Amino acid sequence: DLADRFAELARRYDARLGVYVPATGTTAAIEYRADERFAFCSTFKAPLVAAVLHQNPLTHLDKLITYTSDDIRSISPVAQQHVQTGMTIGQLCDAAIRYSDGTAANLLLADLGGPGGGTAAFTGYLRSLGDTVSRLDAEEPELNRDPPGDERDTTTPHAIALVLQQLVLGNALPPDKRALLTDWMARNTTGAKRIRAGFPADWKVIDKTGTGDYGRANDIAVVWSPTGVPYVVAVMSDRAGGGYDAEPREALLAEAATCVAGVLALE
């Protein structure tokens, strides 16, 4: 019935929905269009921070990065206040996740280095976690704006959910690096109307949002039951039939999350 409930919800919002919740010891995987491609949009910033943590000792977080006004070409709530001061790698990770700061993300991509301003290095990191699906080809803001047919800058709910599983619940990062990523996602400022709005207040939610053209609205989360049982939740959406300026619908993600929460709850 639950694939039917997701299909009804998507029809009612005039959208395409994708959902993946990985299996646990006690729960089946939840999958709806889970192997269909969707744009990352800013959801890639969570694994990008993991890539920078993975590659470097934690002393690297104190490295100062300077930049100029020419580096601000995407929504950058933190980096546009620090053009004259610069920002540390740690401050950039914080901004990339908690404020979805595009300049911060582009500077972290450059910190990974190599062809395409770091986009190849980012993609290679996802390949190292066994993700052969996802790809990042463009920096901010172009990666939000590919037409629906373009595989560039896309992932699948399945792929990104298993990446996030590995990073937050698995062994991809040592505990100190894992704790930094977890905390930044836990204090994200952008996600109140998405997966967070679909889970009861006694569930902890950590997340990273994404938003873009063609009605794209995404959220990737790790949630903790009131008794400390964790689950990964990936919800992706777009509205290819509404044009490049279709309105993203945050509440569709909240409603899909409500359905997920209904199946995961155990009173």
Q: Can you name the CATH fold of 2-264?
A: Beta-lactamase (3.40.710)
Q: What size, in residues, is the chain?
A: 267
Say how far apart CA 81 and CA 87 lie, in whole Å.
Answer: 10
Say how far apart CA 195 and CA 71 lie, in whole Å.
Answer: 31
47, 73, 19: which is closest to 198 by C-alpha?
Answer: 19
Q: Where is 12: in which H helix or E strand?
A: helix 2-13
**Exposed, middle or buried by CB within 10 Å (0-12, 13-18, 19+), for 89?**
buried
Provide the angle, in degrees to the nearest 10, between the axes of the packed helices 175-186 and 89-98.
40
SS3 163: helix
Look-up of token digits 């949002």: 209
**Exposed, middle or buried by CB within 10 Å (0-12, 13-18, 19+), for 228?**
exposed
Say how far apart CA 29 and CA 39 lie, in whole Å.
Answer: 22
Sketch the domain layout of the chain as residue ranges: 2-264
Look-up of token digits 């206040």: 81
Say how far apart CA 53 and CA 47 lie, in whole Å.
Answer: 10
Say how far apart CA 78 and CA 105 lie, in whole Å.
Answer: 11
Q: For residue 10, give Cα distances in angstroms to 32, 47, 85, 224.
A: 11, 27, 45, 26
Provide the angle, in degrees to the nearest 10, between the axes of the packed helices 119-128 and 102-112.
70
CA Rg value for the chain = 17
- Please name the method used to determine this structure: X-ray
Resolution (A): 1.5
Provide the angle, in degrees to the nearest 10, between the axes of the packed helices 119-128 and 45-55.
80
Look-up of token digits 């309105």: 247
Q: Where would I find the H helices in 99-245? A: 102-112, 119-128, 157-164, 175-186, 195-198
SS3 107: helix
Q: Catalytic amino acids?
A: 42, 140
Q: Where is 18: in which H helix or E strand?
A: strand 16-21
74, 225, 54: which is closest to 129 by C-alpha?
Answer: 54
**Exposed, middle or buried by CB within 10 Å (0-12, 13-18, 19+), for 145?**
middle
Q: For residue 145, give Cα distances in angstroms to 46, 133, 150, 152.
A: 19, 19, 10, 10
Neighbours of 141 (CB within 10 A): 18
Give the tokens for residue 159.
């792929």
